Design a protein around this nucleic acid. Structure first.
Lengths: 52, 53, 53, 52, 52, 53
RNA sequence: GGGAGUAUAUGGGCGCACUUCGGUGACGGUACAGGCUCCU
RNA sequence: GGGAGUAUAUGGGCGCACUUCGGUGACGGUACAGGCUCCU
RNA sequence: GGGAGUAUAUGGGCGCACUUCGGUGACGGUACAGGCUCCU
């Protein structure tokens, strides 16, 4: 489908971090999530650059 | 149309080089794991393209 | 002072044109509802101005 | 009173959305709330432009 | 230690406000917290300016 | 190294002037309280510097 | 409703401590009160 | 405390699976550990 | 998943009220439905 839709699908495929646990654990989970988001952004950029 | 999508997927796959088989077993394992994750994402994309066709 | 406030309220009211009585009964109803909401807000303003006088 | 006070009253008259329900429902409620906020901003702008 | 570390220690020494209570009380607590943050920022700036 | 830290602490302390002993007992009290808070923060800093030495 | 700033600001009366009973306390207080300005 | 980035990065030892018992696994792992830099 | 905008926009069928039973209601509705575009 449209590139935008695929990208939205990619962002949808990133699960939110677990709120339970110690502050450090939750912090780590958040950081992992953010890393995933960064990756999604990068690959989304490389997708949008071509394919259209 | 479809050709552009196929070329896109093949491009994404080609842009994902194999992991480095060096260091401890754990290090190699997790490099292979990250790599496999990337591959998995690309396949998710391709499969979604196939699903809408 | 007060004259400016009255002119303001009358201006806001005049700036809110009547809804379009076209289409299905539901469409007309909800146009009238949005319109009535705007009118209600303007009256809330005016009433608050009257309350502080 | 002062225009700013009236505007604050307008923003006070916008109820926060219901957190309960499905993700889609909550999403819709949030969107409605945001629309209301946009309206408040517009009319606040048109008020502040005159009246002073 | 490094100035940055000391500053981080200062920001760590600012306790988050109490979520319990009335809206006005919580508002006040948040404002106090924000004031504390502003202070921390100011003194952090005056520290970083010198000492290095 | 350490000299710069000592100079820093003394500087922070010197940059914190005594409160104003004027007005009601409460006002003076809370000026002294704010002042004491600032002093306390500076000492927290100095003590942390001493702890890492 | 939310936010920013004024703010290295303002200080109100309860409770403790001390007292020569008038008051005093760099004590509870990193508490509490939240005005004014603007933004949303 | 919060955030950003380093990071298309780093990999530690538990449990499974396999085994020629030395090890191996693109298995639990989208888990888990969170250093360094800066911001607040 | 989140956000912005289109939007001073679009209006779908349940329940009330009225009715000449065809319909009507600036009634529940500041409810509810959430498409399209882009961002993350």
């Amino acid at each position: 489908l449209k590139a935008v839709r695929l990208i939205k699908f990619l962002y949808q495929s990133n699960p939110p971090p677990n709120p339970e646990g110690t502050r450090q654990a939750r912090r780590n989970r958040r950081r992992r999530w953010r890393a995933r988001q960064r990756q999604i952004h990068s690959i989304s950029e490389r997708i949008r650059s071509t394919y259209l």
